[PDB]
């Protein structure tokens, strides 16, 4: 997200009724490892953040 500095996990941008854009989310990998993944996007539980993903986290 922009104002927060925490990774909300897997999400997708979607437009809703009234022109308002929503951001759906999903659950996987206990939903906790991604909250700590911020240390990999800003720059075991350390390599797992690099293996489960290809560091394709959306900036801003």
């Amino acid at each position: 997200l922009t104002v927060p500095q925490r990774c909300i996990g897997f999400a997708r941008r979607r437009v809703g009724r009234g022109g308002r854009v929503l951001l759906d989310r999903a659950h996987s990998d206990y939903d906790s490892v991604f909250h700590h993944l911020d240390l990999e996007m800003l720059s075991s539980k350390d390599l797992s953040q690099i293996l489960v993903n290809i560091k394709s986290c959306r900036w801003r």
Binding site: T2, R6, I8, V21, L22, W59
Partner: protein, 82 residues
């Protein structure tokens, strides 16, 4: 004191089980765009799910996605015989 710590931890845990976040901060996220860079440093844009756009021409050929469950595409070369 140990019992108080235990009950406080339990109470805090209960709070975390309702909802972590519920807002999107429309101030910037609403209009701002999202981009990432893969391990190879390649750029890609975030595709947002918009409603069907108005077709201005005869493009957007019918795909029949339900048929793709068993078929993928049509190669150029074939057997080329009766």
């Amino acid at each position: 004191n140990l019992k108080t710590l235990q009950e406080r931890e339990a109470r805090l845990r209960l709070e975390q089980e309702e909802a972590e976040l519920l807002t999107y901060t429309r101030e910037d996220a609403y209009s701002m765009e999202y981009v990432y860079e893969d391990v190879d440093g390649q750029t890609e844009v975030m595709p947002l799910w918009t409603p069907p756009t108005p077709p201005q021409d005869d493009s957007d050929i019918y795909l029949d996605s339900v048929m793709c469950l068993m078929y993928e595409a049509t190669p150029i070369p074939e057997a080329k015989l009766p």
